[PDB]
Design an enzyme around this catalytic site. Structure first.
Site, mmCIF file in Angstrom:
data_model
loop_
_atom_site.group_PDB
_atom_site.id
_atom_site.type_symbol
_atom_site.label_atom_id
_atom_site.label_comp_id
_atom_site.label_asym_id
_atom_site.label_seq_id
_atom_site.Cartn_x
_atom_site.Cartn_y
_atom_site.Cartn_z
ATOM 1 N N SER A 124 0.795 -1.248 0.000
ATOM 2 C CA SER A 124 0.000 0.000 0.000
ATOM 3 C C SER A 124 0.828 1.299 0.000
ATOM 4 O O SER A 124 0.274 2.353 -0.342
ATOM 5 C CB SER A 124 -1.013 0.012 1.147
ATOM 6 O OG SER A 124 -1.772 -1.191 1.128
HETATM 7 C C1 LIG Z 1 -1.351 -2.366 1.888
HETATM 8 O O1 LIG Z 1 -0.240 -2.454 2.322
HETATM 9 C C2 LIG Z 1 -2.424 -3.405 2.034
HETATM 10 N N1 LIG Z 1 -1.780 -4.715 2.042
HETATM 11 C C3 LIG Z 1 -2.184 -5.763 1.314
HETATM 12 O O2 LIG Z 1 -3.195 -5.756 0.602
HETATM 13 C C4 LIG Z 1 -1.346 -6.993 1.534
HETATM 14 N N2 LIG Z 1 -1.638 -7.731 2.537
HETATM 15 O O3 LIG Z 1 -2.839 -7.315 3.197
HETATM 16 C C5 LIG Z 1 -3.046 -8.090 4.448
HETATM 17 C C6 LIG Z 1 -4.317 -7.537 5.064
HETATM 18 C C7 LIG Z 1 -1.849 -7.855 5.354
HETATM 19 C C8 LIG Z 1 -3.275 -9.597 4.138
HETATM 20 O O4 LIG Z 1 -3.470 -9.973 2.961
HETATM 21 O O5 LIG Z 1 -3.290 -10.325 5.143
HETATM 22 C C9 LIG Z 1 -0.175 -7.117 0.650
HETATM 23 C C10 LIG Z 1 0.280 -6.210 -0.255
HETATM 24 S S1 LIG Z 1 1.731 -6.760 -0.980
HETATM 25 C C11 LIG Z 1 1.622 -8.214 -0.019
HETATM 26 N N3 LIG Z 1 2.525 -9.193 -0.151
HETATM 27 N N4 LIG Z 1 0.587 -8.264 0.786
HETATM 28 C C12 LIG Z 1 -3.440 -3.205 3.181
HETATM 29 C C13 LIG Z 1 -4.888 -3.441 2.792
HETATM 30 N N5 LIG Z 1 -3.287 -1.845 3.677
HETATM 31 C C14 LIG Z 1 -2.707 -1.593 4.856
HETATM 32 O O6 LIG Z 1 -2.246 -2.457 5.595
HETATM 33 N N6 LIG Z 1 -2.727 -0.257 5.169
HETATM 34 S S2 LIG Z 1 -2.292 0.310 6.607
HETATM 35 O O7 LIG Z 1 -1.061 -0.271 7.032
HETATM 36 O O8 LIG Z 1 -2.434 1.729 6.589
HETATM 37 N N7 LIG Z 1 -3.449 -0.200 7.780
HETATM 38 N N8 LIG Z 1 -4.712 -0.710 7.375
HETATM 39 C C15 LIG Z 1 -5.342 -0.937 8.557
HETATM 40 C C16 LIG Z 1 -6.686 -1.479 8.770
HETATM 41 N N9 LIG Z 1 -7.733 -0.747 8.312
HETATM 42 C C17 LIG Z 1 -9.034 -1.135 8.466
HETATM 43 C C18 LIG Z 1 -9.375 -2.228 9.169
HETATM 44 O O9 LIG Z 1 -10.643 -2.604 9.360
HETATM 45 C C19 LIG Z 1 -8.269 -3.070 9.741
HETATM 46 O O10 LIG Z 1 -8.543 -4.097 10.392
HETATM 47 C C20 LIG Z 1 -6.917 -2.623 9.481
HETATM 48 N N10 LIG Z 1 -4.535 -0.592 9.633
HETATM 49 C C21 LIG Z 1 -4.844 -0.680 11.070
HETATM 50 C C22 LIG Z 1 -5.659 0.499 11.566
HETATM 51 C C23 LIG Z 1 -4.770 1.681 11.537
HETATM 52 S S3 LIG Z 1 -5.462 3.243 12.036
HETATM 53 C C24 LIG Z 1 -5.971 2.998 13.696
HETATM 54 O O11 LIG Z 1 -6.626 3.503 11.226
HETATM 55 O O12 LIG Z 1 -4.410 4.220 12.009
HETATM 56 C C25 LIG Z 1 -3.329 -0.134 9.135
HETATM 57 O O13 LIG Z 1 -2.388 0.282 9.767
#
Ligand SMILES: *C(=O)[C@@H](NC(=O)/C(=N\OC(C)(C)C(=O)O)c1csc(N)n1)[C@H](C)NC(=O)NS(=O)(=O)n1nc(C2=NC=C(O)C(=O)C2)n(CCCS(C)(=O)=O)c1=O
Length: 500
Positions: A244
């Site tokens: 991401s």
């Molecule tokens: C981007 O990096 C995205 N990653 C992927 O799509 C990949 N794996 O996704 C996961 C979910 C880890 C999987 O498949 O198990 C991927 C890409 S390349 C590869 N080899 N794998 C994801 C969708 N985006 C993020 O992780 N973005 S983030 O780090 O900003 N982030 N997202 C969240 C959540 N948002 C909403 C929800 O409902 C959740 O449960 C998690 N978060 C945690 C919340 C952070 S806050 C409080 O909003 O600041 C987070 O950090």
């Protein structure tokens, strides 16, 4: 009688940080050598000589007998002058001392990966020591000598070639920022029970690497045995899927296409998108309409994929290639990886989507930081440097200034808006960035960003490999590290607060 030529070792050049703090210093050491032909006439002295060298009497005596036809053998290398003088004080015929140089690393583990180290022969073996070996080494000299039939030096006739000392090298590294980055990365690894990590800090205006730390690290002053995993400059030699964190580059292509504006809406319901046998999946799947800023705030893979289908993968690939993802940095660091940005003549739909959200491409932490530096520097990429930059080279405009400025604003909203990555907020400043979470269930937690958002100065990348607690998302794990290190770096660099 025989006329012979012997080398004169050269003093290896001092490595400093950008402010002259010593990072690698050549220290005098004593090499003890012996002529076995001369040693044979003083056998009664051998046990005391063996005892002084901390060797068993018999093993030492056997060693001199086995090398009896030689005129030179090393007794011990790299002793302290005090230790060498103690062996010389025994006055054993056929025993000689020679002054050699050995490196000392005053900051030790703190800058080990960037500085690297020299081998037993004082030659660069890793990091900057290897990359700038020619500059640092200088040139050994040559001495003419007259040797008797036993090979004993009768007279020092003349110097045929004077030794030329190596040259001083000032790194781009700011040791103050390096120590801050080192401590916070170390703390984060402990808090998260993580296996490894990297943290890169870059000056967006000069291309300078202000800090580059990795965990695990090692003491380069005491390299006895110790794990090969600890010596890896991960920021440069390890590749990973950025996930991401590359969505702002897909967004840059979207805004440059003429087809998208930040207030445009994409329907991401029901949080998944089928493309043949592949399913694009979002983490949170309770959205329908999202604007372009919302796609980044919610990190919607579905949303960025629909934008990618509309503009085409070629436009996205071009932005990523132009900012240096999966491209040679030109740094020439030993073992530095290029990674891979996949390409196609005809981009299929699944590959278009995965490119857009950073799946299936491999980059280094240095590459990711350099790409964010270009975005932060109003779309202009300044060439990377591991050395202090006095005259800044011309940059290349890789993203139009208007598009870069719009994306910068969207990334400030990712950090500051309701539902945003609040843990990346930098006290006193406006900050901008994007977190990432890559599944390698094992994860890599990422945060990439820059600050101050109103006039960017620093870009930073935080990579935490395999956090082992309940929390693994980049926004939870890496974002607070970015906040602490960015706040410290801005304060050390006397950057005026912009959140007034
Ligand atoms: C981007 O990096 C995205 N990653 C992927 O799509 C990949 N794996 O996704 C996961 C979910 C880890 C999987 O498949 O198990 C991927 C890409 S390349 C590869 N080899 N794998 C994801 C969708 N985006 C993020 O992780 N973005 S983030 O780090 O900003 N982030 N997202 C969240 C959540 N948002 C909403 C929800 O409902 C959740 O449960 C998690 N978060 C945690 C919340 C952070 S806050 C409080 O909003 O600041 C987070 O950090």
């Amino acid at each position: 009688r025989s006329v012979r030529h012997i080398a004169i070792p050269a003093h290896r050049g001092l490595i400093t940080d950008r402010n002259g703090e010593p990072l690698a210093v050549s220290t005098p050491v004593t090499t003890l050598w012996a002529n076995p032909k001369e040693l044979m006439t003083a056998k009664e002295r051998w046990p005391q000589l063996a005892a002084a060298l901390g060797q068993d009497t018999k093993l030492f005596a056997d060693r001199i007998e086995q090398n009896a036809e030689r005129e030179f053998i090393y007794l011990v290398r790299g002793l302290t002058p005090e230790q060498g003088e103690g062996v010389i004080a025994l006055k054993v015929p056929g025993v000689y001392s020679i002054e050699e140089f050995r490196r000392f690393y005053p900051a030790g583990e703190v800058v080990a990966h960037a500085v690297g180290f020299t081998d037993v022969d004082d030659r660069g073996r890793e990091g900057i020591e290897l990359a700038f070996d020619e500059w640092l080494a200088g040139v050994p000299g040559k001495r003419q000598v007259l040797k008797d039939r036993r090979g004993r030096v009768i007279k020092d006739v003349q110097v045929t070639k004077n030794a030329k000392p190596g040259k001083t090298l000032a790194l781009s590294i700011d040791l103050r920022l390096q120590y801050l980055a080192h401590r916070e990365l170390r703390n984060a690894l402990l808090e998260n029970g993580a296996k490894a990590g990297s943290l890169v800090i870059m000056d967006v205006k000069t291309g300078e690497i202000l800090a580059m730390t990795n965990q695990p690290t090692y003491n380069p002053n005491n390299r006895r045995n110790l794990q090969p995993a600890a010596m890896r400059n991960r920021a440069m030699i390890d590749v990973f899927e950025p996930g991401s964190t590359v969505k702002p580059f897909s967004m840059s292509a979207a805004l440059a296409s003429g087809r998208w504006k930040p207030s445009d809406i994409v329907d991401v319901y029901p949080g998944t998108l089928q493309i043949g046998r592949y399913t694009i999946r979002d983490v949170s799947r309770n959205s329908r309409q999202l604007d372009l800023t919302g796609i980044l705030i919610k990190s919607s893979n579905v949303g960025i994929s629909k934008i990618a289908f509309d503009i085409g993968a070629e436009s996205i690939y071009s932005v990523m290639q132009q900012v240096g993802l999966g491209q040679d940095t030109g740094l020439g660091f030993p073992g530095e990886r290029v990674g891979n940005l996949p390409n196609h003549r005809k981009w299929p739909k699944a590959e278009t989507a995965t490119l857009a959200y950073g799946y299936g491409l491999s980059v280094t932490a240095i590459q990711l930081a350099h790409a964010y530096a270009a975005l932060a520097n109003d779309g202009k990429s300044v060439p990377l440097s591991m050395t202090r930059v006095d005259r800044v080279p011309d940059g290349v405009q890789v993203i139009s200034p208007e598009v870069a400025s719009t994306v910068q604003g969207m990334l400030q909203q990712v950090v500051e808006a309701q539902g945003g990555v609040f843990r990346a907020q930098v006290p006193g400043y406006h900050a901008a960035g994007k977190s990432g979470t890559a599944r390698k269930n094992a994860y890599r937690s990422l945060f990439a960003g820059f600050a101050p958002a109103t006039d960017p100065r620093i870009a930073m990348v935080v990579v935490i490999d395999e956090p082992s607690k309940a929390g693994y998302f980049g926004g939870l794990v890496s974002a607070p590290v970015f906040s602490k290190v960015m706040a410290g770096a801005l304060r050390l660099m006397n950057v005026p607060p912009d959140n007034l």
